[PDB]
Design a protein around this ligand. Structure first.
Ligand SMILES: *[C@@H]1O[C@H](CO)[C@@H](O)[C@H](O)[C@H]1NC(C)=O
Lengths: 208, 198, 386
């Protein structure tokens, strides 16, 4: 349910780990960029330690090699913006003719001009409206988060919830999440996991 | 030489019903395989069903493939739709069947599973505030089509989600200089509900 | 298990069938037996073989699947159940490009293991898809088979111990064998184009590959070869890293395969998967596969005339097929003057061979037959009593 991601500046290098365990011979690496078709970048022959690239690809950009056990590793050099995407490893199954994919890894490269500064959650909590509380014996408190980077974010809530889609406030993002709660005297916590926090945020809610 | 085209970009169907996702491919090979995968928002690429060129139409649980080798059409149908069926569905073409073979994918088609067809329910409309930000919250409505207008700095697209009762809830947030008196009005199912009504 | 890697796209030296007509078992009138016509050594593969009883075609006739020898020539066994009598005469009738008329041959009543796959693709211009036949052996035992003209269009079992494989097995082998088929079909077209051969003519592409394990069951040797029209085209060298190509055309294939890493892929298959499935098959069929039957040998003596006779040294009911029969005369080896027949299948999993020399009368005792077979504790030396 959680997204694996790696964020690197352009010009830098990035290492992604194939989380896929028959110690099979051939493993294929795919790029999936938004609105495009997943495409194979190369594959690795683990018996001969050979990297085979698709046509049109620099011999100096990608590489892949084995590591501890069933973890294979993929490396990109001289990062540019174009390299952002979801990277998959996959291997044809022995049991049944299926190509198995491991959970992909999202690579965000950061543009040169990026002011890499406070890109943590920027909270703003909203208290129920009068009509709600008076008219149906329930209350909605809405935790709003803005000015955070990158879109990867998770929000929970405790003493089931829905949320919006993160959207692009200039070059940072926002996402809100609301609830309706007997538990109107109590108070609730909005629990936000974000990489640039490095611990989870716990946001307090008033009583209504 | 080999290509995969998924014309539809998105598709929406209600619960318990069935949706059909079309796919057209181009291959020079005599015998080949077609695969249908499911991509989760967490990024898992899950295998769903495989169809051989020389096999009969594939059926595997709630998935079925209408194969037409003449037209080179391999449409996947998902019967008895569940809310967790909401994902991006990819059609992929194999080659000969070597362990060195790549899959040629199409761009995906997003499937969104809607609550069942039900009688129309008019919502309640509320305004929420924190300094300049004012959020209009619209509770328990059916159908999905609604226009939420806060009558007045910036406005974001509303969020519509499926409610635990099988209808919809929606929240629209914005920033307005005259925020303290701004209230919300919503046009839904040919009727208009104002926050001032409540 | 067929390879799933290493298979990639790239005159007719005609040779006459040798023909043997024989019975599976020593013939005894009134006891049921099988009559065999073994035809071997021929190229190309279009052949017509009928068995005759008193001149008439026997209707119920089976044949083995097409396979071929190290010189790429083909062999087939035709056989039928039959009960011999004193009066009835049996024969085999064969027709082939290399024969001006059908040949009738009369019946005359008196340590290591390997897995190998053979593939033959025959273009049939104006007669449809190319014919494709794939057979798999463990040592000298066929266990699987595909024939493009058969009804199933599936890999099929030919040994009891492979019948227990799962449906994942038969689907996967059917996938990979059909991949081999389509590769060969592209090759027939391409190769024919390159040599500017007419589209009307039939041509053959042949492929053989496999692996040997020694008695420890660890990888010992691997092979992979490719012929066009019964002639060497390209072959993996014993190191499984480089290629030998004879033709000029085969050199473009050699560069293609060097750049595509075909030999590395084959090596990964031949040293790993091939050996592992060989071990699985050897275990699953150990009662049949891990046996040796020593040859049962004897000598016959037929008087040609008053001044010479034929001494024929027989080896019967042996397994595996590899065997050496040598004649010496006063300790001088007589290979050049020895009639030596091809090793031939009995039909029940054993094999048969004989070797004859013509000896002047009264000097039989100078001639020695020498038999070498793995199932023999020591090599045998036969001599004629009188
Ligand atoms: C609802 O839409 C119809 C469309 O023909 C219109 O006639 C009707 O007046 C609308 N309802 C109201 C309350 O205006």
């Amino acid at each position: 349910g959680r997204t694996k991601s790696v964020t690197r500046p352009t010009g830098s290098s990035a290492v992604i780990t194939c989380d896929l365990p028959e110690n099979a011979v051939y493993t294929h690496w795919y790029l999936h960029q938004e609105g495009k078709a997943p495409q194979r970048l190369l594959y690795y022959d683990s018996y001969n330690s050979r990297v085979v690239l698709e046509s049109g690809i620099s011999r100096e950009k990608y590489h892949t090699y084995a590591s501890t056990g069933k973890s294979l590793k993929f490396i990109l050099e001289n990062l540019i913006e174009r390299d952002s995407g979801v990277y998959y490893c996959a291997t044809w199954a022995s049991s049944d003719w299926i190509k198995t994919f491991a959970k992909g890894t999202r690579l965000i490269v950061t543009s040169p001009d990026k002011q890499l500064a406070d890109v943590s959650p920027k909270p703003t909590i909203f208290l129920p409206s009068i009509a709600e509380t008076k008219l149906q014996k329930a209350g909605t408190y809405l935790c709003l988060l803005e000015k955070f980077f990158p879109d990867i974010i998770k929000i929970h809530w405790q003493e089931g919830s829905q949320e919006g889609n993160t959207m692009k406030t200039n070059d940072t993002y926002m996402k809100f999440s609301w609830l309706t709660v007997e538990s109107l005297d109590k108070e609730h916590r909005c629990i936000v996991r974000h990489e640039n926090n490095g611990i989870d945020q716990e946001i307090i809610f008033p009583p209504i | 030489a080999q290509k995969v085209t998924q014309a539809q970009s998105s598709v929406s169907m209600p619960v318990r019903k069935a949706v059909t996702l079309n796919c057209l491919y181009e291959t020079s090979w005599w015998s080949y395989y077609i695969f249908w995968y499911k991509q989760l928002p967490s990024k898992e690429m899950i295998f769903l069903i495989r169809q051989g060129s020389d096999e009969q139409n594939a059926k595997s649980g709630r998935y079925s493939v209408n194969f037409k080798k003449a037209a080179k059409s391999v449409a996947l149908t998902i019967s008895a739709l569940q809310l967790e069926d909401s994902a991006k569905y990819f059609c992929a073409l194999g080659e000969l069947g070597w362990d060195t073979d790549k899959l040629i994918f199409g761009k995906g088609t997003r499937v969104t599973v809607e609550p069942r067809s039900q009688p129309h329910t008019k919502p309640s409309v509320f305004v929420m505030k924190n300094g300049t930000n004012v959020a209009c919250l619209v509770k328990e409505f059916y159908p999905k089509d609604i226009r939420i207008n806060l009558v007045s700095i910036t406005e974001f697209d509303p969020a519509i989600v499926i409610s635990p009762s099988g209808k919809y809830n929606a929240v629209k947030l914005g920033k307005y200089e005259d925020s303290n008196s701004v209230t919300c009005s919503v046009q839904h199912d040919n009727k208009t509900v104002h926050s001032t009504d409540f | 298990e067929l390879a799933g890697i290493g298979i990639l796209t790239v005159g007719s030296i005609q040779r006459t069938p040798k023909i043997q007509v024989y019975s599976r078992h020593p013939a005894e009138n009134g006891k049921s037996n099988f009559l065999n016509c073994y035809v071997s050594g021929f190229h190309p593969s279009d052949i017509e073989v009928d068995l005759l009883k008193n001149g008439e075609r026997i209707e119920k006739v089976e044949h083995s699947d097409l396979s071929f020898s190290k010189d790429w020539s083909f062999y087939l066994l035709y056989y039928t159940e039959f009960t011999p009598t004193e009066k009835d005469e049996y024969a085999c009738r064969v027709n082939h490009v290399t024969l001006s008329q059908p040949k009738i041959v009369k019946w005359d009543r008196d340590g290591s293991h390997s897995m190998r796959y053979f593939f033959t693709s025959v273009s049939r211009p104006g007669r449809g898809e190319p014919r494709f036949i794939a057979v798999g052996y463990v040592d000298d035992t066929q266990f699987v088979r595909f024939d493009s003209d058969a009804a199933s269009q599936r890999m099929e079992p030919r040994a009891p111990w492979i019948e227990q494989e799962g449906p994942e097995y038969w689907d996967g082998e059917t996938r990979k064998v059909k991949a081999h088929s389509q590769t060969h079909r592209v090759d027939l077209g391409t190769l024919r184009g390159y040599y500017n051969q007419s589209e009307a003519g039939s041509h053959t592409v042949q492929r053989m590959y496999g692996c040997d394990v020694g008695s420890d069951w660890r990888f010992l040797r691997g092979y992979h070869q490719y012929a066009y029209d019964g002639k060497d085209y390209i072959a993996l060298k014993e190191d499984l890293r480089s290629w030998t190509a004879a033709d000029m055309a085969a050199q473009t294939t050699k560069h293609k395969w060097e750049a595509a890493h075909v030999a590395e892929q084959l090596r990964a298959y031949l040293e790993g998967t091939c050996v592992e499935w060989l071990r699985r098959y050897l275990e699953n069929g150990k009662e049949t596969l891990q046996r040796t039957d020593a040859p049962k040998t004897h000598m016959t003596h037929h008087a040609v005339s008053d001044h010479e006779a034929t001494l024929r040294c027989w080896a019967l009911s042996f397994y595996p097929a590899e065997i050496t029969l040598t004649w010496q005369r006063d300790g001088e080896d007589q290979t050049q003057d020895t009639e030596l027949v091809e090793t031939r299948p009995a039909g029940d999993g054993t094999f048969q061979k004989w070797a004859a020399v013509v000896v002047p009368s009264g000097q039989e005792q100078r001639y020695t037959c020498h038999v070498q077979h793995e199932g023999l504790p020591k090599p045998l030396t036969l001599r004629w009593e009188h």
